């Protein structure tokens with residue numbers, strides 16, 4: 001595979017968002033992945049709605065948690081494959097409470113046909129990402145609260161509890177690393193991003209990788 005890939009360089013990644021006091025990381029991970037896949041399918045980069053999932057995805061638990069795979073399936077099976085634009089369904093869960101789901105007054109910004117679950121292997125995940133784009137992954141974010149920058153070479157890897165987005169990697173660096181987009185504002189980490197060492201399953205990054213498919 002290529003030595004280094006950074007999808008931000010191809011204009012495929014939207015700006016870092018803010019989940020606030022809501023445990024909606026799974027929604028940001030899922031939507032972030034859809035935003036990138038949609039752009040890669042030949043459409044203009046569009047900000048999509050995490051609120052749609054937090055409020056309407058009943059197979060998940062809003063601010064109490066959820067699974068990116070459940071989110072992908074809900075979109076296809078329950079929402080006719082539709083994903084609203086963020087402007088038409090703004091995020092309003094920053095306080096920790098998800099307002100009721102509204103089935104109208106929104107605009108469809110993207111559509112997906114399904115999703116694939118990637119192998120629990122970093123080399124294989126990197127190969128897929130290099131050609132197909134950003135991947136939604138689950139990680140153990142225990143060590144992430146004190147992250148200020150640089151490549152994290154040691155990460156607590158015990159229990160998956162956070163959903164994020166893999167936007168790239170660099171195998172030619174001193175210590176190969178993954179480039180990850182987080183949803184805790186640009187004030188956290190490296191302008192909202194975090195780089196973790198690649199190759200030793202840091203933060204359990206290879207355990208639950210997946211991506212939406214936009215036919």
Ligand SMILES: *[C@H](CS(=O)(=O)Cc1ccccc1)[C@H](CCc1ccccc1)NC(=O)[C@H](Cc1ccccc1)NC(=O)OCc1ccccc1
Nearest residue numbers: 023025026060061063064065066067138160161162163208
């Ligand atoms: C987002 C995490 S966060 O808020 O950014 C950081 C954090 C970690 C742990 C505890 C608090 C904050 C989600 C937080 C959920 C939550 C909220 C309040 C208390 C406890 C937990 N994390 C999730 O949503 C995780 C992400 C994940 C995705 C895939 C695989 C493993 C983890 N998912 C989760 O908890 O799902 C539970 C569930 C809910 C509904 C249906 C099935 C499973």
